[PDB]
Amino acid sequence: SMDFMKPETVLDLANIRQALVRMEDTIVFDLIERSQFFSSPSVYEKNKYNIPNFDGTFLEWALLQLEVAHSQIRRYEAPDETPFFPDQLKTPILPPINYPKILAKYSDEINVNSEIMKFYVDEIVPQVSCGQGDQKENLGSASTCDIECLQAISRRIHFGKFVAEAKYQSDKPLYIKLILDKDVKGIENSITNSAVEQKILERLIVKAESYGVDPSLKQNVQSKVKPEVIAKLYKDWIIPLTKKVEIDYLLRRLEDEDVELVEKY
Amino acid sequence: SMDFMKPETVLDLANIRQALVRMEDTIVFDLIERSQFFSSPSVYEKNKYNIPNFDGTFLEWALLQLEVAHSQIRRYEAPDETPFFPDQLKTPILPPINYPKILAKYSDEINVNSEIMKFYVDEIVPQVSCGQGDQKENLGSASTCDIECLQAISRRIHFGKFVAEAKYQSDKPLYIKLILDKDVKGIENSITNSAVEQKILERLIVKAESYGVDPSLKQNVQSKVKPEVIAKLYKDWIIPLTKKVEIDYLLRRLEDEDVELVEKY
Numbered sequence: 298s299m300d301f302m303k304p305e306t307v308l309d310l311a312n313i314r315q316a317l318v319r320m321e322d323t324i325v326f327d328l329i330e331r332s333q334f335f336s337s338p339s340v341y342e343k344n345k346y347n348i349p350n351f352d353g354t355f356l357e358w359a360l361l362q363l364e365v366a367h368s369q370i371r372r373y374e375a376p377d378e379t380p381f382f383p384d385q386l387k388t389p390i391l392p393p394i395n396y397p398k399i400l401a402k403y404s405d406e407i408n409v410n411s412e413i414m415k416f417y418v419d420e421i422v423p424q425v426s427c428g429q430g431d432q433k434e435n436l437g438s439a440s441t442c443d444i445e446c447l448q449a450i451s452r453r454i455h456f457g458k459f460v461a462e463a464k465y466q467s468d469k470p471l472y473i474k475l476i477l478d479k480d481v482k483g484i485e486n487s488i489t490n491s492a493v494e495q496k497i498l499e500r501l502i503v504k505a506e507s508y509g510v511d512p513s514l515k516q517n518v519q520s521k522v523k524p525e526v527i528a529k530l531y532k533d534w535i536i537p538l539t540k541k542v543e544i545d546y547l548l549r550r551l552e553d554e555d556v557e558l559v560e561k562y
Numbered sequence: 563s564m565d566f567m568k569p570e571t572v573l574d575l576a577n578i579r580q581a582l583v584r585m586e587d588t589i590v591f592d593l594i595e596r597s598q599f600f601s602s603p604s605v606y607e608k609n610k611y612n613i614p615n616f617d618g619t620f621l622e623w624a625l626l627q628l629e630v631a632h633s634q635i636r637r638y639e640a641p642d643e644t645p646f647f648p649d650q651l652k653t654p655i656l657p658p659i660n661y662p663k664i665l666a667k668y669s670d671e672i673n674v675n676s677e678i679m680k681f682y683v684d685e686i687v688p689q690v691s692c693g694q695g696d697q698k699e700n701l702g703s704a705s706t707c708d709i710e711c712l713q714a715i716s717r718r719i720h721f722g723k724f725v726a727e728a729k730y731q732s733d734k735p736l737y738i739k740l741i742l743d744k745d746v747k748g749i750e751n752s753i754t755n756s757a758v759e760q761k762i763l764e765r766l767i768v769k770a771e772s773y774g775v776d777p778s779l780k781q782n783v784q785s786k787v788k789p790e791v792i793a794k795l796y797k798d799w800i801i802p803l804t805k806k807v808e809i810d811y812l813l814r815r816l817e818d819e820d821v822e823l824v825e826k827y
């Protein structure tokens with residue numbers, strides 16, 4: 298029932314988990330589409346193409362163009378959108394959506410898109426690609442799929458901000474105590490549910506099978522993305538980084554609280 | 563095993579079959595992602611928003627921005643990409659890929675993207691959207707999903723150029739006699755296989771259920787996109803328009819053959 302014009306429907310743990318489940322499908326679809334192309338080392342080589350006045354990889358350059366264009370139509374006014382190039386965005390040409398306040402004022406500074414870009418290129422691309430290879434005529438196709446994947450993974454991971462804020466407002470006296478202690482381990486314990494995480498991993502295995510296998514053949518019955526690769530993407534990267542976002546958000550949460558935490562400290 | 567650097571592997575009717583089948587997954591995935599948003603009438607209303615120096619809908623404006631950016635990196639030098647705005651593209655900033663010749667010289671002139679935009683907006687959007695209504699904070703999200711859908715559908719329909727050229731080269735003598743005699747029905751009969759059409763259709767219904775139903779919930783099983791809507795999309799629009807591309811390609815095929823056609827004359 299998530300409605301970003303109604304904060305109470307966004308800061309609802311049941312609505313949040315339902316959206317997270319739906320994001321599993323989105324991410325799996327995007328990886329399956331990226332599995333159409335080879336490892337494509339040229340996409341991720343720094344300045345392989347001497348694009349004038351630009352420094353970086355081809356993927357970074359194509360991502361920068363999309364981000365710049367999407368900033369013109371307010372994509373990063375949304376609280377569930379976190380840009381990879383926050384300093385290079387331009388003023389939108391459409392008037393503001395004017396979202397209600399949901400997250401604390403500093404929330405845009407919680408940005409781990411650099412670590413996402415790093416593990417996506419170094420760990421995921423080699424594992425979801427259909428093979429090792431570099432086809433010049435698929436430079437653009439592969440990098441567009443990369444962008445789709447990168448933006449779905451970044452949305453999922455930075456959704457931890459909504460998880461953290463909803464958890465904060467359900468139990469302010471506990472979290473005020475933890476934040477003033479800087480009890481990083483305590484914060485992690487308060488947000489972690491290992492049993493739920495294992496059941497996410499198991500549902501991902503079945504989604505990779507059901508979405509990644511053509512349902513017309515039962516003679517070449519392999520999934521076009523390895524299910525354990527999908528499960529490992531969450532276990533090793535997406536879930537730990539979501540918690541880092543949540544922890545970093547809470548550690549600064551008293552910056553945007555009334556000094557009536559003198560009551561609870 | 564299509565290698566667009568190898569013409570013999572592209573004009574392989576078996577290789578074309580597999581690529582069209584792989585495109586079924588891509589289209590179903592995109593419609594499934596579009597089904598997250600409402601019918602969004604504001605996206606498709608002409609000149610609704612205050613966008614300088616432009617006449618059209620917001621979707622058309624956003625699609626134009628993308629096509630212009632992608633043309634800078636040679637997307638429409640590819641013979642399997644057909645632009646929606648062919649007269650508004652920009653000069654590429656990268657040197658060309660240099661594709662070998664696969665299709666006839668006039669191939670870029672057969673372009674049914676106007677028809678695709680029309681039936682997508684008028685017939686597909688209302689049937690896949692989660693409901694009727696506008697949601698201002700999802701104008702961007704819904705338009706981007708539309709663009710993914712439109713580009714996947716356009717690529718599938720304009721793939722009929724490769725189909726026609728592959729058929730033409732498999733049995734030349736047959737087709738010239740037909741093209742010489744302006745028999746659109748005889749050409750239509752030679753390229754139509756109704757039995758395979760019913761088979762891709764039955765596969766689509768199964769694909770819609772496998773990709774659109776959360777497999778952890780496989781009593782109330784509700785697909786994200788109605789299986790009958792995906793079937794009717796191919797039956798009423800995609801298949802007929804692909805054949806239209808094929809006939810219009812073959813009807814002009816003699817423009818790119820030396821006049822030793824006089825043999826078959």
Ligand SMILES: N[C@@H](Cc1c[nH]c2ccccc12)C(=O)O
Nearest residue numbers: 434435436437438441632637640
């Ligand atoms: N596959 C071709 C054409 C293409 C498809 N989508 C693209 C997006 C961007 C650039 C190019 C493309 C290429 O990579 O060049």
Ligand SMILES: N[C@@H](Cc1c[nH]c2ccccc12)C(=O)O
Nearest residue numbers: 367372375699700701702703706
């Ligand atoms: N949902 C918001 C933010 C957003 C997400 N993806 C987008 C893509 C383009 C533009 C905006 C967005 C909007 O449509 O405004």
Ligand SMILES: [Mg+2]
Nearest residue numbers: 323327445595
């Ligand atoms: Mg997607």
Ligand SMILES: [Mg+2]
Nearest residue numbers: 432433565567
């Ligand atoms: Mg090659």
Ligand SMILES: [Mg+2]
Nearest residue numbers: 330588592710
């Ligand atoms: Mg897609």
